[PDB]
Amino acid sequence: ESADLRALAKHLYDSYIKSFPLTKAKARAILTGKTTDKSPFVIYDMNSLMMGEDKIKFKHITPLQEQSKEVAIRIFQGCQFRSVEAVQEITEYAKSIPGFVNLDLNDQVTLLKYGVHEIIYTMLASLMNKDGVLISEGQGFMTREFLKSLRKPFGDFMEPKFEFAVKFNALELDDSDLAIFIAVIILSGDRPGLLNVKPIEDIQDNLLQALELQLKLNHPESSQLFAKLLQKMTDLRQIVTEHVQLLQVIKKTETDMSLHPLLQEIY
Amino acid sequence: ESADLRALAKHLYDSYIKSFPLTKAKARAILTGKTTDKSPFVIYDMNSLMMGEDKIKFKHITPLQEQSKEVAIRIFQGCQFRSVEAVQEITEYAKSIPGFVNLDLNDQVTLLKYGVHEIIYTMLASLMNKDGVLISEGQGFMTREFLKSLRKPFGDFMEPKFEFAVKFNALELDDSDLAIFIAVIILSGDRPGLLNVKPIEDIQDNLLQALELQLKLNHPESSQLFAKLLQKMTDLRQIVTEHVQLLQVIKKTETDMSLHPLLQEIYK
Numbered sequence: 043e044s045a046d047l048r049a050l051a052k053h054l055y056d057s058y059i060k061s062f063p064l065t066k067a068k069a070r071a072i073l074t075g076k077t078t079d080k081s082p083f084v085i086y087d088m089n090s091l092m093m094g095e096d097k098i099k100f101k102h103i104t105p106l107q108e109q110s111k112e113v114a115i116r117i118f119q120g121c122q123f124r125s126v127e128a129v130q131e132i133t134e135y136a137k138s139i140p141g142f143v144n145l146d147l148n149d150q151v152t153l154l155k156y157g158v159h160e161i162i163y164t165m166l167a168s169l170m171n172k173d174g175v176l177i178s179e180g181q182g183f184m185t186r187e188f189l190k191s192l193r194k195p196f197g198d199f200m201e202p203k204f205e206f207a208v209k210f211n212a213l214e215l216d217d218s219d220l221a222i223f224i225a226v227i228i229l230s231g232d233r234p235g236l237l238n239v240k241p242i243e244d245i246q247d248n249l250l251q252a253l254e255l256q257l258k259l260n261h262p263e264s265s266q267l268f269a270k271l272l273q274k275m276t277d278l279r280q281i282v283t284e285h286v287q288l289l290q291v292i293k294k295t296e297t298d299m300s301l302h303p304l305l306q307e308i309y
Numbered sequence: 310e311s312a313d314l315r316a317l318a319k320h321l322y323d324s325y326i327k328s329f330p331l332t333k334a335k336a337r338a339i340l341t342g343k344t345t346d347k348s349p350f351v352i353y354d355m356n357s358l359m360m361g362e363d364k365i366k367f368k369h370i371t372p373l374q375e376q377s378k379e380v381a382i383r384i385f386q387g388c389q390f391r392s393v394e395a396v397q398e399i400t401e402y403a404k405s406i407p408g409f410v411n412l413d414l415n416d417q418v419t420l421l422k423y424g425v426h427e428i429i430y431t432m433l434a435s436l437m438n439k440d441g442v443l444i445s446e447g448q449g450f451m452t453r454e455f456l457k458s459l460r461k462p463f464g465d466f467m468e469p470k471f472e473f474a475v476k477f478n479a480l481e482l483d484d485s486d487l488a489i490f491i492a493v494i495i496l497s498g499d500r501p502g503l504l505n506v507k508p509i510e511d512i513q514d515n516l517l518q519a520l521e522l523q524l525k526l527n528h529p530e531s532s533q534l535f536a537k538l539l540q541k542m543t544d545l546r547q548i549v550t551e552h553v554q555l556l557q558v559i560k561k562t563e564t565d566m567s568l569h570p571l572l573q574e575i576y577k
């Protein structure tokens with residue numbers, strides 16, 4: 043019944059607004075969108091990020107550059123922190139989804155183990171555009187060119203993300219849309235190791251239904267947007283796989299150091 | 310007007326038929342061991358394969374395998390010819406797709422080139438069941454275990470396909486549905502090297518409305534089948550990957566074995 047889908051939709055939307063600080067309406071005003079009044083400290087050069095964290099309240103590293111731990115390394119360890127953060131936000135948005143907790147815990151844990159990854163790149167596109175990506179709650183904006191002028195490893199790290207974001211943003215979705223789109227992702231059912239897929243698919247079915255009417259009523263003119271949207275979810279599955287390749291090569295760059303232990307444990 | 314999408318649906322199901330000598334419906338009638346209208350010869354070991362030459366059309370080696378092109382090679386050079394065959398059949402079906410042969414000529418090629426294997430594995434599932442796959446216009450049937458037990462390199466090669474088939478076939482689609490879904494695969498838009506995407510995405514963003522209505526009518530119960538079907542194109546692209554690379558391997562350990570010219574102008 044239509045009434046339930048608009049309900050489920052509104053439920054998830056209000057829940058999504060509570061769970062995620064920096065939203066897209068927001069990030070879109072701060073970014074290219076004018077809403078000029080507060081604008082975000084820019085980072086384009088190696089002197090720009092140098093001591094840059096001045097304003098910007100960073101947790102982990104400060105403006106130190108002189109053969110003391112490479113800039114590239116300290117920029118990647120940053121994303122990871124944010125990652126660890128987002129995973130928590132998401133783990134909570136998950137509980138908010140109708141029926142999620144009523145499932146087998148083992149299953150709730152697996153759905154997150156694999157889902158947390160696609161949702162992160164999905165939302166990172168909310169804080170990105172062809173020129174750069176928003177950072178530090180929105181007090182930042184690290185240019186795209188600066189990111190590509192990074193060490194040999196890290197040069198392709200974020201490029202395959204700006205490409206996806208550019209395409210994904212062309213769909214022009216809003217937080218009310220991504221709310222449902224993101225639920226659908228989590229409640230996949232084809233994730234490895236699940237134990238009772240029926241339940242997991244009954245909800246996604248219900249979530250998919252809601253996503254459909256939502257895009258209809260919310261994009262009356264965008265012909266076949268539902269379909270194109272579900273397609274972009276394949277590019278996500280690929281961008282996530284390719285991400286562990288340039289990551290595995292990292293496992294073969296740092297290492298043997300006894301002052302890491304309680305850190306490599308966190309990540 | 311849902312009357313044009315239905316007329317477009319008819320159009321496609323028709324060429325699909327004219328382009329593929331073996332349909333999924335012909336394939337299932339042979340597999341479900343029940344319509345002994347013609348049954349297949351089941352190859353499952355060496356002796357059986359040796360006999361397969363007589364009972365079925367195998368212009369391949371009979372006696373010795375290892376020494377004179379080991380059995381593993383015999384099977385591959387054959388499965389190869391089957392594919393060049395397949396590509397031409399799909400090249401035909403492409404041309405039949407409205408708007409296709411009007412797009413820039415390079416884009417046509419570009420679409421075929423990447424569109425091919427995706428379609429070949431989607432169709433290869435129509436000939437597979439939890440235990441094997443039809444071969445030679447359906448005259449024969451090769452066992453999943455037989456294959457899964459071949460020389461180190463060739464051994465695995467078909468095992469990511471059988472997996473795809475079981476889950477994919479689960480959707481229980483029929484030939485008229487695979488026709489619209491197959492067109493949607495070629496007329497994509499996010500393919501490497503394309504010159505103009507708008508006129509191409511225009512076609513897909515119309516075939517899709519066709520696949521949607523087709524599925525709501527054809528499967529009034531299978532809910533979210535439209536959405537579930539599309540999500541299949543992901544497990545698809547992953548297969549090509551395993552292939553192309555597993556192909557790199559043989560290309561080096563088997564330097565006396567060739568490859569069909571047409572099957573080269575497609576891998577990148």
Ligand SMILES: Oc1ccc(/C=C/c2cc(O)cc(O)c2)cc1
Nearest residue numbers: 367369383384387388391444445
């Ligand atoms: O000695 C041999 C003689 C013939 C073959 C044929 C293999 C083959 C595999 C397919 O998927 C489709 C097909 O139509 C044929 C393999 C070994």
